[PDB]
């Protein structure tokens, strides 16, 4: 099970989630179960936390192949969070048993995808480039921002979300 697109809308008003189940033959029995949204405040390592930001159960929408693909567009202001200074964690679940021929390690019910707003980062890069235009010297804040973004990338791809939030809160919010 995987993500098709997991993006925040360019208008900074919707959080786009478009999930799908993998096309391989032995997820025929497997479906999509729920969508749980967490922020940098309510995250826990062991799956979604209690009192989450927004829970979604997918039988509610439909009345079986329609249930294998889902698309959500959440008005972020309705979630009562800041679209610019929020890092969303999007969990998904399966509620379904694959066949007995699955190769090992592929049978995992849950996934996760981190989300942030790239507009503030784009504005910071534009500001630093404007500074570079004057006298052709590289500000050190620009290199610091680049390397800290790469640090958060490494933390996310290695799954070390606690230190990822620590860096986010320490550098890209305050």
């Amino acid at each position: 099970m995987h993500f098709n697109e997991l993006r925040i809308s360019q208008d900074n008003r919707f959080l786009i989630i478009d999930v799908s189940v993998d096309n391989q033959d032995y997820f025929e029995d497997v479906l999509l179960d729920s969508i749980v949204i967490d922020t940098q405040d309510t995250f826990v390592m062991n799956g979604p936390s209690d009192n989450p930001l927004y829970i979604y159960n997918v039988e509610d929408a439909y009345d079986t192949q329609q249930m294998k693909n889902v698309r959500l567009e959440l008005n972020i202001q309705d979630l009562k969070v800041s679209p610019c200074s929020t890092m969303f964690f999007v969990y998904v679940k399966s509620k379904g048993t694959p066949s007995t021929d699955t190769p090992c390690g592929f049978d995992k019910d849950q996934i996760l995808g981190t989300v942030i707003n790239l507009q503030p980062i784009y504005k910071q890069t534009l500001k630093y480039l404007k500074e570079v235009e004057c006298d052709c010297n590289i500000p050190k804040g620009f290199i610091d921002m680049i390397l800290k973004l790469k640090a958060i990338e490494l933390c996310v791809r290695t799954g070390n979300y606690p230190q990822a939030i620590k860096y986010w809160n320490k550098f890209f919010i305050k």
């Binding site: 390592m45 996310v156 290695t158 799954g159």
Partner: protein, 107 residues
């Protein structure tokens, strides 16, 4: 957890490997080893019933201070398939060059 076990075993094995090669490890790092294995036995014992999720948050965010502190303790690696910017593999398929009253359309 089953992972605090692995980190603690790795840390103390590295500690005794250093004491085999050298004859000295900084006690400022022996303190970190002590904290680490004390926490793991705390969480894998009869005192794991007194922890809320806020306590879990605090414990994890305090243990991550020990992650890259010394060579004995390392940043754990989890199975992750995410990133800060994701790829858009959606495909475009309009219907016989049609549009809605305002915009485009697809299958």
């Amino acid at each position: 957890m089953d992972k605090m076990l692995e980190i603690s075993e790795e840390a103390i094995t590295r500690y005794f490997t250093t004491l085999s090669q050298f004859g000295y490890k900084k006690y400022s790092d022996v303190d970190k080893i002590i904290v680490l294995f004390f926490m793991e036995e705390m969480l894998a014992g009869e005192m794991s019933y007194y922890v809320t999720q806020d306590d879990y948050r605090n414990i994890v965010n305090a243990l991550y201070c020990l992650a890259g502190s010394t060579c004995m303790i390392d940043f754990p690696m989890f199975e992750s398939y995410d990133t800060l910017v994701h790829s858009n593999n959606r495909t475009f398929v309009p219907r016989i060059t049609e549009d809605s009253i305002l915009r485009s359309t697809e299958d």
